[PDB]
Amino acid sequence: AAVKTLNPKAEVARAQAALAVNISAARGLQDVLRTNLGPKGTMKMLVSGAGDIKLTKDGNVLLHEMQIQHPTASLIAKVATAQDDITGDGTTSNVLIIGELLKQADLYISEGLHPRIITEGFEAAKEKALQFLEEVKVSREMDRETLIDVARTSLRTKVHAELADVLTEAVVDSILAIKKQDEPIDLFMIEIMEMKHKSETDTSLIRGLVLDHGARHPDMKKRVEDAYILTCNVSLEYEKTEVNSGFFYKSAEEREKLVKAERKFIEDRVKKIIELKRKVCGDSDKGFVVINQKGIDPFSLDALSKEGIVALRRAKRRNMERLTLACGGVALNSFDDLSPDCLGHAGLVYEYTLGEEKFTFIEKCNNPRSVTLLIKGPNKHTLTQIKDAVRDGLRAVKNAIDDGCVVPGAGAVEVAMAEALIKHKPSVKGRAQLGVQAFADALLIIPKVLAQNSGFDLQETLVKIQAEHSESGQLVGVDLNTGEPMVAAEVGVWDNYCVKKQLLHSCTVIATNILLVDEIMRAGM
């Protein structure tokens, strides 16, 4: 080869070898990720080099933790990562469709057909498929029931059935709580916290905040009923000047005077806080809680606790916004002029200590626009799995709200799109009809793999569903319990319209670009 002639240590695959290598890698990825698809999938154990155990079913997570060093695998992994980052679901279907598209294209390329014709067929079929997807979407008002159905359709695929049943309610309630009318949903305003002391089904939604730290002064109150929340970003600890000053005295009395004087700056701000606390609540019935992003030195902690004030230091940067939205105060960067109107309110603040670490709960807010999800479980890997599941569920609900529509699931849309493409195939002029057929057959992978994972047989189940769809015209999917065709809309199995659209676009683009590659070179050394 020319490259090896120039660079002796060059690894090069050319012509049909390039296609063989790429398609083999895609087929390997598809073979591994077949078993993930559907609620009846199989969980995978992932053990890192350090020995960390991570049970998972997510396509993107598994792709990240597969021990793979292949270029085509890297490209597919990047596609899946983009899909997950934007939409949040469909990575397993993404990999499956890419691999099956490549296989179907190879089925004709092996007969001496140039890949360009297949790619033209892919493009025409994708255009028709997008038209059909626009045609088949169900524009429905996103009430609670529909969001619950979407959350089920995601979480049941990710986790156990009962845990999914709990997580649906948690996720849907949280999204509805933080969502304002005709405004984009900010998922940063939902906090996901880890507690490792109860069963997995004890995960619930707290209409407030949970903080992974508590008061550092032992004399502070451990439970405040009616609390005034002060969210501040002011440092309440001694800070040296910026000019490198130092002190100069001549006797012990002068040293004591300078020791007492050097603390006056922080003492004034602590005095302002205490004065506000006295002003707002002259009785001991109410409570005052100070949450600070900057540190608090022990002297300030003692001075504050002597007035019955709960103080938490070094809170998270986003916790400022979260507390502002939930409790309803104003995040102050200075105490230059503070007024009672800058104080948030919480109907209950109490501290939970688990093992060595400490937690603080801020509940019973008036109308929190920022809530938190408390993930509970007996193992670390269980917590990680539940975190991934709730991420998928929140993304699914957010997508369902953002789109005014929703797409029937269970692979029904895939069957309908395949039949529509087959009917449209005569309209395409030339040999691109072969590419259209390849695209339709590739789209048909989802019901095939669903039936395969459910334990039935691919051919018979698929032909039964296709015959039923042709006879009746309804959107019939795969019943994972009996194998019979079922109307996905009637039984409340819903996909995401945006997820399907992104699936079509990304899969077609990456398959088209991979098919046209005719040489892999590694000559940068």
């Binding site: 154990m45 053990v47 020995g51 100069f248 193992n379």
Partner: protein, 538 residues
């Protein structure tokens, strides 16, 4: 014709040292085998007749014990499935305090029976569903097996009787003595408020006199000595400081600027006078014991000796906070004299030597106080550590009893009753889940079987007798270990009782661990790394 190449696809894109297992034989059966190996490893240390094990960790520290959680912690377990079972055992230890060996044995039995069920033809989903149904049935049944309640926790005798069963599995020979000690320590703590803190019971290990010489002290003991001439106070008025016992200095930078001779002459005299004034101000408040958390200056020590003040220095801030809780003082951040509402009081503070260790004792006389201390004696450090573990188990049992006062019969009676009821329920259940329910019931026999094996009798005869008596209607009859032949006796009269929460959480965690292990179908292990340990674990 001479080699079998790796299959095209995933088998060729795998990394160098990575391993991939899939399917029943390669993954599920291997996981079950590893869990069975771990359970068999820890099985021999179960029950009162459990035999201690010497475990040498990678740091060559020697552990002798029969606590399952400790053994699993000190063992370098590498199999991921066994690792998950160990996580379940540790979670049981953290949540309740005792029952880790029960979790291990039950999970192992469940997984072995799952392997049997899979081999006879059942699917993994059916096995998991049957186990879940049976676990729910067991959790429903368990409240009906409660025999008696604690009914009082301020009574020394009853509390010791309750704790005897918990700390007789460990230290079988002498459990009455340790029960009395831990009962005294727990009854001193646990005030009128229902909250009981396990951390308020401290254990001090002093070597030399055999464990029969151990005692409980209503106060705190520190393995150090005083710093001044005064070594004993009878009416202590301790004042506690977190600052060093020295003149406080500027935080920015201190420079003594001298511009004349008089300042140079007078500086040290003024510093000494100021230190003397501060110490005298402290002493005039009535305080005669000063406890500081930092360095002690030489001039400050001189003036403390001058005014007859006992100086004690505590390095650990945890010890400082515990001492403040015990005495009733507040840690002052500056060297100011304490006001009368924050000067702690202790009925006696003195320096004493026990064995050959100097100890400072903050001793009360009332049967009260926030913190109590159990000073252990013995002849070996390892033996005293074992006694400390037993004390920890007893205190955790007391805490559980405060949280929930219900008790279930021990000695395997509860397990046999649960097995019988679950089998009866499964016989009425049609469908393929009846096999899994019956296997879950049968897995409960692993507890009386292990007890009988350890006691040296024939397990089969014991289990047959247990079924016979339970079918007769006696639900409180378990294994009698005080006999050379298989025999049974009533646990309620004998007094072997187990906490309800202990069994509840143990069953829940063991079932969850077994189900989670079963759910795994494929394993992808990365190549092991020989780095300088993960940074997260320090």
């Amino acid at each position: 014709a001479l080699h079998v190449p790796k299959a095209p696809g995933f088998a060729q894109m795998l990394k160098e040292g990575a391993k991939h297992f899939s399917g029943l034989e390669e993954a599920v059966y291997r996981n079950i085998q590893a869990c069975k190996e771990l359970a068999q490893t820890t099985r021999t240390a179960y029950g009162p007749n459990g035999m201690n094990k010497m475990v040498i960790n990678h740091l060559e520290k020697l552990f002798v014990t029969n606590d399952a959680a400790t053994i699993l912690r000190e063992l370098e377990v590498q199999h991921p499935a066994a690792k998950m079972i160990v996580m379940a055992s540790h979670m049981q230890e953290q949540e309740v305090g005792d029952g880790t060996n029960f979790v291990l044995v039950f999970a192992g039995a469940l997984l072995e029976l799952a392997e049997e069920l899979l081999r006879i033809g059942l699917s993994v989903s059916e096995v998991i569903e049957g186990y879940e149904i049976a676990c729910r049935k067991a959790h429903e049944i368990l409240p009906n097996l409660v025999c008696c309640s604690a009914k009082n926790l301020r009574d020394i005798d009853e509390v010791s009787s309750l704790l005897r069963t918990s700390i007789m599995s460990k230290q079988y020979g002498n459990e009455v003595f340790l029960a009395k000690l831990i009962a005294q320590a727990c009854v001193s703590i646990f005030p009128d408020s229902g909250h009981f803190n396990v951390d308020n019971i401290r254990v001090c290990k002093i070597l030399g006199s055999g464990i029969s010489s151990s005692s409980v002290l209503h106060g705190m003991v520190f393995k150090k000595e005083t710093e001044g001439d005064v070594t004993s106070v009878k009416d202590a008025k301790i004042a506690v400081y977190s600052c060093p016992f020295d003149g406080m200095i500027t935080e920015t930078k201190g420079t003594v600027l001298i511009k004349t001779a008089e300042e140079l002459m007078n500086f040290s005299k003024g510093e000494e006078n100021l230190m003397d004034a501060q110490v005298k101000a402290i002493a005039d408040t009535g305080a005669n014991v000063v406890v500081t958390g930092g360095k002690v200056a030489d001039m400050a020590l001189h003036y403390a000796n001058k005014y007859n003040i006992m100086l004690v220095r505590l390095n650990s801030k945890w010890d400082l906070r515990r001492l403040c809780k015990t005495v009733g003082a507040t840690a002052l951040p500056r060297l100011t004299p304490p006001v009368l509402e924050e000067m702690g009081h202790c009925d006696s503070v003195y320096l004493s030597e026990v064995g050959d260790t100097q100890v400072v004792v903050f001793k009360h006389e009332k049967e009260d106080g926030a913190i109590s201390t159990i000073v252990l004696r013995g002849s070996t450090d390892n033996l005293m550590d074992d006694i400390e573990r037993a004390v920890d188990d007893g205190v955790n049992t007391f805490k559980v009893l405060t949280r929930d006062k219900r008790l279930v019969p021990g000695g395997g009676a509860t397990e046999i009753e649960l097995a019988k009821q679950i089998t009866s329920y499964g016989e009425t259940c049609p469908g393929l889940e009846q096999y899994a329910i019956k296997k879950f019931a049968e897995a409960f026999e692993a507890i009386p079987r292990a007890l009988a094996e350890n006691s040296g009798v024939k397990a089969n005869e014991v289990i047959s007798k247990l079924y016979a008596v339970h079918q007769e209607g006696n639900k409180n009859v378990g294994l009698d270990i005080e006999a050379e032949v298989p025999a049974v006796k009533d646990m309620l009269e004998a007094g072997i009782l187990d906490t309800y929460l202990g069994k509840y959480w143990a069953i829940k965690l063991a079932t969850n661990a077994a189900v989670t292990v079963l759910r795994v179908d494929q394993i992808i292990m990365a190549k092991p790394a020989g780095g300088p340990k993960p940074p997260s674990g320090k």
